[model samples]
Target: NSLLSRALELQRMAHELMYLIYSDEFCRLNKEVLTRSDSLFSEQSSDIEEEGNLCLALLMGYNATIYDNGDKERKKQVILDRIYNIMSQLPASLLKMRLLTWGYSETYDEELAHEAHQLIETWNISDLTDEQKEIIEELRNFEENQYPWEEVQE
Candidate 1:
């Protein structure tokens, strides 16, 4: 089959997962998809590999969404461990940037925030887009507040 097509498909899936994880039907309707797609992340090795890796990274977010609904530390820690594993494989791209921000905001982990800063330092400020630069500044400031999902209508 087509590899590039699969990459595009997973990229689309990542965007969908980001929103769908907030829905009540997520675990019932989407968990199966996550299970089926779980192995897809481990098979990356191309220029398009980062895209696939991003999808995998977002899946941990999906798992976190479900774990939050359950209300416990141990389960969320499992998802965090998975995030750490995937983060090791990812490079300093937009995906890594997003993951680092999400990790620190969710867990308020000092280490994750430090890692985010390290990644930011690696980039030339001029090379980043305005939005990306703004995100960097926001991460550096890091005010505690409700995440976007918390603002969603319950």
Candidate 2:
């Protein structure tokens, strides 16, 4: 829990993504990216801050995709804009596919699904660094839990 990375991992997978961005873990963590173009970014380095926010946007957007109820328009706009903005910076690396999968998995976009499909189909394990591999491992390790995101109050 002391390790920042692991703490972040828990929030991203267990809370933000899994719990409709509404959890004790969510409140316990830094949520600067939830604001529209607003944040301390809260990371020491600007680069880390941008990267962190991008990751947050991707995860939150994924939640929006799978369990969308249109409950919060302004919040969704902030998240969607952050996602669109961050995706523009992805073409430079293989990491782009990883980023693309976040949104693409939410729908059945043929071309991108085909592209993402091919990447997973033809990758060599040796091509990735240990950190990248770990990231992939962490990304795959979430349990699906049903929450009450869409249940209307009577």
Candidate 3:
């Protein structure tokens, strides 16, 4: 109860922060809390709801931290790619799909990137299960309606 509420609030804060300035210190700051927050989830829960969300929040920052200037250093794309793959491995749900879509999405454009990774070697946007498609449809409603889309470039 406490953890869900606590973790969710932090997730929102982290999301907004990403839209602001994404410095390494920002990455580490969010990482520290979200990393610590994973322990709040029950170890025995088969569905890592809380844990996955923490990773999802941090994964954005992790992707942000790798660049030297404003350009993406190609080699470290491996590290960013690695983090996204980890997000893909978490239990399936609308949220998981949401993360998968966003994690693959070019931050430059909100469009989900074409999935063609060799690792996990399976599943793609076109191949999502029916249940997941329905979830994605629902989630898009909230995403579409969120204000301040113009406020952030990324």
Please identify model 2 stretches exceeding 4 Å from their true place: 1-27, 30-94, 125-154
**Which candidate order results from sorting by TM-score in descending order?**
1, 2, 3
- How close is every model to the real structure, measured as TM-score? 0.48, 0.38, 0.35
Error of 3 at 136 (Å): 10
For residue 49, give model 1's deviation from the true position in Å: 5.4
Model 1, position 41: C-alpha lDDT score: 42
Worst 10 residues of 1 by lDDT: 63-72
Error of 2 at 79 (Å): 5.8
Q: What does the lDDT read for residue 14 in candidate 3?
A: 50
Better of 1 and 3 by lDDT: 1
How many residue pairs clash per model?
A: 0, 0, 0
**lDDT for model 1, on a 0 to 1 scale?**
0.57
Tens digit of per-residue lDDT, candidate 3, span 14-75 = 54554456777876766654453344322222345665565454444334333234333442
- Per-candidate Cα lDDT values, in order, are 0.57, 0.43, 0.48
Worst 10 residues of 2 by lDDT: 36-45
Candidate 2 clashing pairs? none
